[PDB]
């Protein structure tokens, strides 16, 4: 695999963007207990499908959704085109089990979002599930979905053809797509060959994607070393190199990095979970991702009435108030020469090092960097000079006051370009 | 309270009818985890209310619902006008939290059902909750609804006025109403005066109901001695005199009796519960209720797409095929002079005793009844004669074959009217 | 022959008849799981490490254990035999085995072979001793491959199934050599491998070699196997767990009733091993009726007690047993020495029979007449079993109708009916 | 009111010097092996639970082996449960037959045996004693726990208080010198308005009795609030002073000697399902972090029903001791340092010496926010090599040749003036 020039350009734009919004939306939103409900509660596949003919998110408005997300500073959206329950949220001809043909809503919401994304300057990424709890040609089964009541059995080859045909539709009828974001491969990690490219038909899938849209980036949330043909690496609920959530532990690759996370605790809408992370924690999460050279893909789970959660919209609005001031210290940067520490992180652009102080009550900060003369240091907002001392061992900044919250940012200007590790 | 003559007339018709269908339907059908979900999961009243603007039961059809129910032999429907979550399934003007104003469906389903009920000859009963998990004027709180996020406090007097105004709408704008079926007063059984008529404004409520529709029957699912003004007594998930479900134990009154039960395990739609009682068990439940002089109110929980569960429609249809043969042995009867036994039950009408053999391998049956000469005994369906021996100790019936299922019915004719 | 190839010896057939005559035995589930007092399955249920669990043995000291007192309290109930766990699923041996040091003599400070002590007192007091033995083992690494249980007990090495089978053969040999005459071996656990296509075969479980070995050592020893399916050739009794034969209220049965002697087993509270949270012991009335219903279905009742970690039988269980024996002092002849009666069980009760005698056990009837579907044998007399008062009856070609002067009393209103001809079996 | 004796004040300073002790929770709840709260948590009938006693025989118990394994860690004292909430006495009390000597086949006074060995091996013995009782019917009225243990008779609170006084007298008369009484359980009555008063719990009389029999005996009471007059140590449960990650703290830091208690696995009593013992690295750093906050660490082990200390805990203690063999002077005999805890580590101090404990740092330099006291020298504590430093009015910057090693990279700084205690 050798990525095309347009793909490489897209990789650079992706890393420049730093911030996107995940959207998990499907008929599981009506049950309002998370996107895994079909499997978690062993719901019969035919009984679950009866929900579709009552699905009517009357307050859905794509312009409003995209506007609310753009106001956060985010530059792209990743939306579930089809999740594990096998329901398609677009006008597919591969199955009548889709938002157009099976619901009274009768509208291709992916189409409506694509149109508004294009109009508002937001890039559209498509989540697509390798795992299927409904179709009988997902056979043999893996570790999940054994309780969903399937009693017939089809051919894996036909399931793979189904996925190819759906990917082809998604990359034909919805304009330029910035990425395909695969998920679910891990379902067969119980078999010896269950995590191979051959088992999952990855080479054919990736070649097909890049043939239709060479600039489209491919990610696959398998939590292991990226397969040839992937263009981004995904870390689920952890910064690269961290494993507090237990879904990581894999080596950091050379691909563009993206951490995904929930704003409350769940990907799909969950009516019992209204505990949304504070704006301060969300801002620091984005800064910490940027400081580890990674994008943040922050999730919102839309309601069954088609509105984004009001509290999520407020958080996004307030993140955008901060981005109004600080976006140039995050967007367009890469992880800085000083890797993340307990006090905070650094990001860099050209000859500029942004020092993001997130957690420090003292009035001095040692930076382990030498060999590049520091010409100036100022507070990013006020532009006041920051006193400093530099020698062959590093740089010591001194501050007039306690670092303020949520991020006390210093702009350091060096004589030479900062190295890219 | 002395019931009007129209009310007494309605009480006898109710008992004649013997069989009705309960319907629990609301926006809780969307969450498909039972009608109690708002309390069970301590759902915030404002967050729960956001569900209404996505409620669109597009496959609802009142004519199909009523026809599927009529086909079972059932004679009446009891539907939730407003349950504990406080959402009104009708075009109330007392709150904007209703099916017409708060949902994109925009249709008064109770008015559509009332119209089909009247056209198809089915009587309409209305369930109404005394308990409210949403309104801040339901104050002080009882034992439920403490977790639904209310932070303002109103006045019980205004909540009582709310209930009166809704009852007036229901008994004025929907034609003749066969019964008001109250529920939820047990929520305040934790307080010393929590279960009094004064606390719950029952006398003013009951008088209002009977003023607007004197023939309307009043039931109250309080699980205790019926209050003056009530016209039916409710046993929840048990036959009168039994307490296998733990919600009964109260003395049997002289009011008409009604047992309510679920066809699967839950009143509201519940996607995890697809375990519907067999047709045999449902038929036997109706017969056992009749044999204890009680109606059976059997429940269906409609889906959020507006359809009755297809398996429930099937069960109803199959009950109706049985009723097409056997309806005269339970409708128009009262509990029989021989009270329920392990082998089955009896029902009666005039001088006729119907013996319902539900569970018997023997080719004979002893009946402990004496003092009334038995003139004839036949198989109800075949009309063939059944040999019998009668003396002062009782009656012994003898059969040619072992009793068939689900109900082997004998028709016995006595010289004198059977006592009640 | 009920079971081809296998022909039971004359002495085995005699033991089968005595077993059915006895009708009533007491199950005893005792082991170091009694210390944890949360049931005999605790090592699997809580995924306890096999090495950590074994550390319990060096603290096991049931100082109030008294074999004579146990056997006396059990004899007092009318029970005729005891079935005791020699080794349950946790793999701990409650006797002086040379196949493993993980046993009550070598691994505990108690240092006493309690099966030997019980066998001696059973012989002294006229009670027969049956031995439970587990096919399933959650400790040994030669229980390999695993079945559906025991995957969480921390085994990290693997042995050979052939060595596990040799281990069981040599333990069975010890049990049938060193403890006198043994009335039955009661196997359990082979359902563990019902997840495999050949997992329930005689070949997988080495049953033919085991059964042949048992009957070679003690031809009169009866073999039962709690597999919940059709009995394998060489078994001499059929077990129904927590149900009467033909019933399946507890969900562990459903298998056809064989021609072997039948035995239903049940707990007196809800659990087999001692369980400190479960003090809900069935009433004497329910226990008496359970024994009668078993006898009426031609089955023995094996009723369980789970001894405490201090070595005592639960006081409430001893009281129930005493009160059952008070009833048996009067009514034992209507159950012991009988077989299931020509009238099979009904909602009102059951019948048992012996010779020309039919005992009608009315367990649940408020009316003052009872129809009995039996004809072809002249009824000569009917009396109340205890008072001996005559019971009025009418007999014709369709059956018998008894009439009673009073509502039937509890827990069992027994009538004794005497016929002209032997009752059929 | 309360003025501590000269001997009490001396014992307070020795306790703080010692820094490190081992908690032992042992009782017949060890046989059920599901925690010391089991009789309440599972609503066990008090009579049925007591039947366990006649099967209790910890045949592998050996007081010398226990004390030896604890001494090998560097710890200087042991705190053992003389009687926990289940009401069972682990010593030869004459106030109840429900005790290890009279009610079990073991027939041995394990507190006596431990006291003998503690004296022989030079380890101080502290006695935990529960104010809460789930068995006795004179614990009446009930508080929030123990309502399911099946009591159907009612005694008198004054008789329960007399029972406690009589047991405390035994423990302070028949067992040699006792370094502390460690009370627990009065929070049971925090549901009543007067439920946390000294009057309700008879504390003044109890404390006066303890200090009359053994004036140097230190009194602690795990009530999670401001210490009562007469207490000589303050207890923080599962948190360092000033922290509340475990939710049992939040009380102001007093001027009494401070002690944080914690479990090695997750439970105080033996728990057969819980074999997740904190790593030696985490245990050493816990001890250092406690010392850096001017607190002792009381680290728990829950002995098995066969009488052995868990072997993994013995091994952890041994490894702790291998670290203490090198680093004990940087912890024992110190007080919390003038630089309070930071993300990178902590400081401790003695005289003019500041020990800088680097616990979590990838840099080859460290800024210390301390001024007004001239730094005379800085060395690596273990190697003794000099550490370069810069000092000015804003603080001190230390520079290191290599990345700090684990579990604790210790620098020894020597100042011109005595370090203050704030
Ligand atoms: Na009868
Ligand atoms: Zn378009
Ligand atoms: Zn012997
Ligand atoms: Zn001594």
Short mmCIF file of N, CA and C in Angstrom, two decimals, chain B residues 221-323:
data_model
loop_
_atom_site.label_atom_id
_atom_site.label_comp_id
_atom_site.label_asym_id
_atom_site.label_seq_id
_atom_site.Cartn_x
_atom_site.Cartn_y
_atom_site.Cartn_z
N UNK B 221 -58.51 0.46 42.22
CA UNK B 221 -57.55 -0.62 42.47
C UNK B 221 -56.69 -0.33 43.70
N UNK B 222 -57.36 -0.20 44.84
CA UNK B 222 -56.69 0.09 46.10
C UNK B 222 -56.34 -1.15 46.89
N UNK B 223 -56.84 -2.32 46.50
CA UNK B 223 -56.51 -3.59 47.14
C UNK B 223 -57.12 -3.73 48.54
N UNK B 224 -58.13 -2.91 48.88
CA UNK B 224 -58.76 -3.00 50.20
C UNK B 224 -60.28 -3.00 50.07
N UNK B 225 -60.98 -2.81 51.19
CA UNK B 225 -62.44 -2.79 51.16
C UNK B 225 -62.93 -1.66 50.26
N UNK B 226 -63.85 -1.92 49.33
CA UNK B 226 -64.30 -0.84 48.44
C UNK B 226 -64.92 0.31 49.22
N UNK B 227 -64.63 1.53 48.78
CA UNK B 227 -65.22 2.72 49.38
C UNK B 227 -66.64 2.93 48.86
N UNK B 228 -67.51 3.45 49.73
CA UNK B 228 -68.85 3.84 49.30
C UNK B 228 -68.76 4.68 48.03
N UNK B 229 -69.58 4.33 47.05
CA UNK B 229 -69.56 4.96 45.74
C UNK B 229 -68.98 4.10 44.65
N UNK B 230 -68.13 3.14 44.99
CA UNK B 230 -67.61 2.19 44.02
C UNK B 230 -68.68 1.16 43.65
N UNK B 231 -68.64 0.75 42.38
CA UNK B 231 -69.61 -0.20 41.83
C UNK B 231 -68.99 -1.52 41.40
N UNK B 232 -67.67 -1.61 41.30
CA UNK B 232 -67.01 -2.88 41.05
C UNK B 232 -65.82 -3.00 42.00
N UNK B 233 -65.44 -4.24 42.28
CA UNK B 233 -64.27 -4.53 43.09
C UNK B 233 -63.22 -5.24 42.24
N UNK B 234 -61.98 -4.80 42.38
CA UNK B 234 -60.87 -5.22 41.54
C UNK B 234 -59.93 -6.11 42.34
N UNK B 235 -59.57 -7.25 41.77
CA UNK B 235 -58.51 -8.12 42.28
C UNK B 235 -57.40 -8.15 41.24
N UNK B 236 -56.20 -7.71 41.64
CA UNK B 236 -55.09 -7.57 40.71
C UNK B 236 -54.24 -8.83 40.70
N UNK B 237 -54.20 -9.50 39.54
CA UNK B 237 -53.41 -10.70 39.31
C UNK B 237 -53.81 -11.87 40.21
N UNK B 238 -55.03 -11.88 40.72
CA UNK B 238 -55.52 -13.04 41.44
C UNK B 238 -57.03 -13.14 41.26
N UNK B 239 -57.52 -14.37 41.30
CA UNK B 239 -58.95 -14.61 41.43
C UNK B 239 -59.40 -14.16 42.82
N UNK B 240 -60.67 -13.77 42.97
CA UNK B 240 -61.14 -13.41 44.31
C UNK B 240 -60.89 -14.55 45.28
N UNK B 241 -60.40 -14.21 46.47
CA UNK B 241 -60.10 -15.19 47.49
C UNK B 241 -58.74 -15.83 47.41
N UNK B 242 -57.96 -15.55 46.37
CA UNK B 242 -56.60 -16.06 46.22
C UNK B 242 -55.61 -14.91 46.32
N UNK B 243 -54.36 -15.24 46.65
CA UNK B 243 -53.32 -14.21 46.81
C UNK B 243 -51.96 -14.74 46.39
N UNK B 244 -51.93 -15.49 45.29
CA UNK B 244 -50.66 -16.04 44.81
C UNK B 244 -49.71 -14.96 44.34
N UNK B 245 -50.23 -13.82 43.89
CA UNK B 245 -49.41 -12.71 43.41
C UNK B 245 -49.09 -11.69 44.49
N UNK B 246 -49.69 -11.79 45.67
CA UNK B 246 -49.32 -10.93 46.76
C UNK B 246 -49.91 -9.54 46.74
N UNK B 247 -50.83 -9.24 45.82
CA UNK B 247 -51.45 -7.92 45.75
C UNK B 247 -52.90 -7.92 46.22
N UNK B 248 -53.36 -9.00 46.84
CA UNK B 248 -54.75 -9.12 47.25
C UNK B 248 -54.81 -9.39 48.75
N UNK B 249 -55.67 -10.31 49.17
CA UNK B 249 -55.90 -10.58 50.57
C UNK B 249 -57.09 -9.85 51.17
N UNK B 250 -57.71 -8.95 50.42
CA UNK B 250 -58.85 -8.21 50.92
C UNK B 250 -60.10 -9.08 50.85
N UNK B 251 -61.06 -8.79 51.74
CA UNK B 251 -62.31 -9.54 51.73
C UNK B 251 -63.06 -9.35 50.41
N UNK B 252 -63.81 -10.37 50.02
CA UNK B 252 -64.66 -10.29 48.83
C UNK B 252 -65.93 -9.52 49.20
N UNK B 253 -66.19 -8.44 48.48
CA UNK B 253 -67.38 -7.63 48.73
C UNK B 253 -68.58 -8.19 47.96
N UNK B 254 -69.70 -7.47 48.01
CA UNK B 254 -70.90 -7.82 47.24
C UNK B 254 -70.98 -7.08 45.91
N UNK B 255 -70.01 -6.22 45.61
CA UNK B 255 -69.98 -5.59 44.30
C UNK B 255 -69.63 -6.62 43.23
N UNK B 256 -69.96 -6.32 41.98
CA UNK B 256 -69.41 -7.10 40.86
C UNK B 256 -67.89 -7.19 40.94
N UNK B 257 -67.37 -8.37 40.64
CA UNK B 257 -65.95 -8.67 40.81
C UNK B 257 -65.26 -8.74 39.45
N UNK B 258 -64.02 -8.24 39.41
CA UNK B 258 -63.21 -8.24 38.20
C UNK B 258 -61.77 -8.52 38.58
N UNK B 259 -61.18 -9.55 37.97
CA UNK B 259 -59.77 -9.87 38.09
C UNK B 259 -59.04 -9.35 36.85
N UNK B 260 -57.93 -8.64 37.04
CA UNK B 260 -57.11 -8.21 35.92
C UNK B 260 -55.80 -8.98 35.89
N UNK B 261 -55.28 -9.18 34.68
CA UNK B 261 -54.08 -10.00 34.50
C UNK B 261 -53.43 -9.63 33.18
N UNK B 262 -52.14 -9.93 33.08
CA UNK B 262 -51.37 -9.68 31.87
C UNK B 262 -51.32 -10.93 31.01
N UNK B 263 -51.31 -10.72 29.69
CA UNK B 263 -51.19 -11.85 28.77
C UNK B 263 -49.76 -12.39 28.72
N UNK B 264 -48.76 -11.50 28.58
CA UNK B 264 -47.37 -11.83 28.96
C UNK B 264 -47.23 -11.47 30.44
N UNK B 265 -46.09 -10.94 30.86
CA UNK B 265 -45.90 -10.61 32.26
C UNK B 265 -46.11 -9.17 32.66
N UNK B 266 -46.33 -8.26 31.71
CA UNK B 266 -46.27 -6.83 31.99
C UNK B 266 -47.45 -6.12 31.34
N UNK B 267 -47.84 -4.99 31.95
CA UNK B 267 -49.00 -4.23 31.46
C UNK B 267 -48.62 -3.40 30.23
N UNK B 268 -47.62 -2.53 30.36
CA UNK B 268 -47.12 -1.82 29.19
C UNK B 268 -46.27 -2.72 28.31
N UNK B 269 -46.11 -2.32 27.05
CA UNK B 269 -45.26 -3.07 26.14
C UNK B 269 -43.85 -3.20 26.71
N UNK B 270 -43.27 -4.38 26.57
CA UNK B 270 -41.95 -4.69 27.12
C UNK B 270 -41.22 -5.59 26.13
N UNK B 271 -40.22 -5.05 25.45
CA UNK B 271 -39.63 -5.74 24.31
C UNK B 271 -38.92 -7.02 24.73
N UNK B 272 -38.42 -7.09 25.97
CA UNK B 272 -37.77 -8.31 26.45
C UNK B 272 -38.76 -9.41 26.85
N UNK B 273 -40.05 -9.11 26.97
CA UNK B 273 -41.03 -10.08 27.45
C UNK B 273 -41.96 -10.47 26.30
N UNK B 274 -41.61 -11.56 25.63
CA UNK B 274 -42.38 -12.13 24.54
C UNK B 274 -43.01 -13.47 24.95
N UNK B 275 -43.15 -13.70 26.25
CA UNK B 275 -43.64 -14.97 26.78
C UNK B 275 -45.14 -14.85 27.05
N UNK B 276 -45.93 -15.03 26.00
CA UNK B 276 -47.38 -14.91 26.09
C UNK B 276 -47.99 -16.23 26.52
N UNK B 277 -48.87 -16.17 27.52
CA UNK B 277 -49.58 -17.36 27.98
C UNK B 277 -50.26 -18.06 26.81
N UNK B 278 -50.22 -19.39 26.84
CA UNK B 278 -50.87 -20.19 25.81
C UNK B 278 -52.37 -19.93 25.77
N UNK B 279 -52.97 -20.24 24.61
CA UNK B 279 -54.42 -20.11 24.48
C UNK B 279 -55.15 -20.98 25.49
N UNK B 280 -54.66 -22.20 25.72
CA UNK B 280 -55.26 -23.06 26.73
C UNK B 280 -55.28 -22.38 28.09
N UNK B 281 -54.14 -21.80 28.51
CA UNK B 281 -54.08 -21.20 29.83
C UNK B 281 -54.99 -19.97 29.90
N UNK B 282 -55.08 -19.21 28.81
CA UNK B 282 -55.95 -18.03 28.80
C UNK B 282 -57.42 -18.42 28.90
N UNK B 283 -57.84 -19.41 28.11
CA UNK B 283 -59.22 -19.89 28.20
C UNK B 283 -59.52 -20.37 29.62
N UNK B 284 -58.61 -21.17 30.20
CA UNK B 284 -58.85 -21.68 31.55
C UNK B 284 -58.89 -20.56 32.58
N UNK B 285 -58.12 -19.49 32.37
CA UNK B 285 -58.15 -18.36 33.29
C UNK B 285 -59.52 -17.67 33.28
N UNK B 286 -60.06 -17.45 32.08
CA UNK B 286 -61.40 -16.89 31.95
C UNK B 286 -62.45 -17.77 32.61
N UNK B 287 -62.36 -19.08 32.39
CA UNK B 287 -63.33 -20.01 32.98
C UNK B 287 -63.21 -20.02 34.49
N UNK B 288 -61.98 -20.04 35.01
CA UNK B 288 -61.81 -20.04 36.45
C UNK B 288 -62.33 -18.75 37.08
N UNK B 289 -62.13 -17.61 36.42
CA UNK B 289 -62.72 -16.37 36.91
C UNK B 289 -64.24 -16.46 36.94
N UNK B 290 -64.84 -16.86 35.82
CA UNK B 290 -66.29 -17.02 35.78
C UNK B 290 -66.77 -17.94 36.90
N UNK B 291 -66.04 -19.04 37.14
CA UNK B 291 -66.45 -19.99 38.17
C UNK B 291 -66.37 -19.44 39.58
N UNK B 292 -65.59 -18.37 39.78
CA UNK B 292 -65.50 -17.65 41.05
C UNK B 292 -66.36 -16.39 41.02
N UNK B 293 -67.26 -16.30 40.05
CA UNK B 293 -68.20 -15.18 39.92
C UNK B 293 -67.50 -13.86 39.62
N UNK B 294 -66.45 -13.91 38.79
CA UNK B 294 -65.68 -12.71 38.49
C UNK B 294 -65.46 -12.56 36.99
N UNK B 295 -65.37 -11.31 36.55
CA UNK B 295 -64.92 -11.00 35.20
C UNK B 295 -63.40 -11.17 35.10
N UNK B 296 -62.92 -11.41 33.88
CA UNK B 296 -61.50 -11.37 33.56
C UNK B 296 -61.22 -10.19 32.63
N UNK B 297 -60.32 -9.30 33.06
CA UNK B 297 -59.82 -8.17 32.28
C UNK B 297 -58.37 -8.50 31.93
N UNK B 298 -58.17 -8.95 30.68
CA UNK B 298 -56.90 -9.52 30.23
C UNK B 298 -56.19 -8.43 29.41
N UNK B 299 -54.89 -8.24 29.66
CA UNK B 299 -54.19 -7.07 29.16
C UNK B 299 -53.41 -7.32 27.87
N UNK B 300 -53.34 -6.27 27.03
CA UNK B 300 -52.39 -6.19 25.92
C UNK B 300 -51.66 -4.86 26.00
N UNK B 301 -50.35 -4.88 25.74
CA UNK B 301 -49.55 -3.67 25.72
C UNK B 301 -49.11 -3.29 24.33
N UNK B 302 -49.75 -2.28 23.74
CA UNK B 302 -49.46 -1.96 22.33
C UNK B 302 -48.04 -1.44 22.12
N UNK B 303 -47.54 -1.66 20.90
CA UNK B 303 -46.18 -1.31 20.50
C UNK B 303 -46.06 0.19 20.23
N UNK B 304 -44.84 0.73 20.23
CA UNK B 304 -44.69 2.17 19.91
C UNK B 304 -44.98 2.50 18.45
N UNK B 305 -45.06 1.51 17.57
CA UNK B 305 -45.48 1.75 16.19
C UNK B 305 -47.00 1.72 16.05
N UNK B 306 -47.73 1.44 17.13
CA UNK B 306 -49.18 1.50 17.12
C UNK B 306 -49.90 0.20 16.86
N UNK B 307 -49.18 -0.91 16.70
CA UNK B 307 -49.83 -2.20 16.49
C UNK B 307 -49.99 -2.94 17.81
N UNK B 308 -51.09 -3.67 17.94
CA UNK B 308 -51.18 -4.67 19.00
C UNK B 308 -50.18 -5.78 18.69
N UNK B 309 -49.50 -6.34 19.70
CA UNK B 309 -48.59 -7.46 19.42
C UNK B 309 -49.27 -8.57 18.64
N UNK B 310 -48.61 -9.02 17.57
CA UNK B 310 -49.21 -10.02 16.70
C UNK B 310 -49.51 -11.32 17.45
N UNK B 311 -48.65 -11.71 18.40
CA UNK B 311 -48.94 -12.93 19.14
C UNK B 311 -50.19 -12.74 20.00
N UNK B 312 -50.36 -11.55 20.58
CA UNK B 312 -51.57 -11.30 21.37
C UNK B 312 -52.82 -11.33 20.50
N UNK B 313 -52.74 -10.78 19.29
CA UNK B 313 -53.89 -10.85 18.39
C UNK B 313 -54.23 -12.29 18.06
N UNK B 314 -53.21 -13.12 17.86
CA UNK B 314 -53.41 -14.55 17.64
C UNK B 314 -54.12 -15.21 18.82
N UNK B 315 -53.62 -14.97 20.03
CA UNK B 315 -54.27 -15.55 21.21
C UNK B 315 -55.72 -15.10 21.31
N UNK B 316 -55.97 -13.80 21.12
CA UNK B 316 -57.34 -13.30 21.15
C UNK B 316 -58.21 -14.02 20.13
N UNK B 317 -57.69 -14.17 18.91
CA UNK B 317 -58.45 -14.83 17.86
C UNK B 317 -58.80 -16.26 18.25
N UNK B 318 -57.85 -16.98 18.86
CA UNK B 318 -58.08 -18.38 19.23
C UNK B 318 -59.02 -18.49 20.42
N UNK B 319 -58.94 -17.56 21.37
CA UNK B 319 -59.95 -17.51 22.43
C UNK B 319 -61.34 -17.36 21.81
N UNK B 320 -61.45 -16.53 20.77
CA UNK B 320 -62.73 -16.29 20.15
C UNK B 320 -63.30 -17.50 19.44
N UNK B 321 -62.43 -18.35 18.88
CA UNK B 321 -62.88 -19.60 18.26
C UNK B 321 -63.46 -20.54 19.32
N UNK B 322 -62.89 -20.54 20.53
CA UNK B 322 -63.47 -21.30 21.63
C UNK B 322 -64.80 -20.70 22.06
N UNK B 323 -64.84 -19.38 22.22
CA UNK B 323 -66.03 -18.67 22.66
C UNK B 323 -67.18 -18.87 21.68
#
